[PDB]
Amino acid sequence: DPTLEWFLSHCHIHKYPSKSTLIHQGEKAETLYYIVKGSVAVLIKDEEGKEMILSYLNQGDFIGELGLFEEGQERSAWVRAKTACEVAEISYKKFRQLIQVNPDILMRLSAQMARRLQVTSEKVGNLAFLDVTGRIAQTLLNLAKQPDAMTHPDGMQIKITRQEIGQIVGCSRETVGRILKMLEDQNLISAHGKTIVVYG
């Protein structure tokens, strides 16, 4: 992809090990990132340090983009590497010059912003309108149709901790365990360790 190749030639690229923080909430935003390889989690926290994952992003995703548009703003969320990552970085000032040369690179960025607004709006709906059981069931459904889910005789096999589920749906790890047991009892999933088979 020539447009992305051109953009990346103007970036400087860096390796982040698994679990490192790319972006800290509250930092002053002056640069844009783009994931060349790997995946990250975007998260927010409450007064007590409970975490809610807003999104996973992966190869091909921009990160740190929301600052490009307002002079001197603070990063709104933490971004943590879930795997080893290779990340390209560019200042906003240089990226604005690229936009002038070829506004297709802004279109690519803005397409991902629009998708993220839709996804996050759906999350608002889920938190407002679904109970925690329905949120968990929708999450397991989603993880099963992810590229990293492994086919199984009876559905798809996924690997996720109860803690990570609770960070997606907004509940404690104890509440996750109780709901997973219920779904097992209903013959809708199987659960063994960090492994869950989602039937159907």
Added chain:
Amino acid sequence: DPTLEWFLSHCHIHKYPSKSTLIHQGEKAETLYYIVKGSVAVLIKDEEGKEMILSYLNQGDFIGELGLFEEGQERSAWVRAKTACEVAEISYKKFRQLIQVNPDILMRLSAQMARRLQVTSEKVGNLAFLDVTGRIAQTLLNLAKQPDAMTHPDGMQIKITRQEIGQIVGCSRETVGRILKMLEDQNLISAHGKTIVVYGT
């Protein structure tokens, strides 16, 4: 400024009365709108027809923008006029031609998308982390911080109905009215008119 003037010269401008739907969820998206005058709400609905307000947008805001980026998408939300609106309309096709001329028009639209994603992300946190009283309290704090809030000797004065708060936080107007009376009793707010004063705001 004259960027906005030039853009509006390529649009068709039309009027929506108060309460009328501009965009329905599920319609095919092929056109972008820009609010010349008025205010709208962006809304989603649950299975029982309960509504939740995702955003209020105003003069200078783009609406219907999210479908510009990928061909053949559905509208993701309803957009309903709060006051009567005058809205400029342009096809996605024509708008993409204007972007080549001056991409500041896409910068302005994307700055608004960026802000909306931050507001909606904060809403995810509030719904995950706060109970209904806490969500009402944060809604009042958010309204007291807005440009359109009025300085008052006890704090900031806002204008918002109980039904409006309920559609924002996800509760009935009667639940809102009970909780505002409670907050008043804790000496945190005044009710009164159509009007709430958020103390220490």
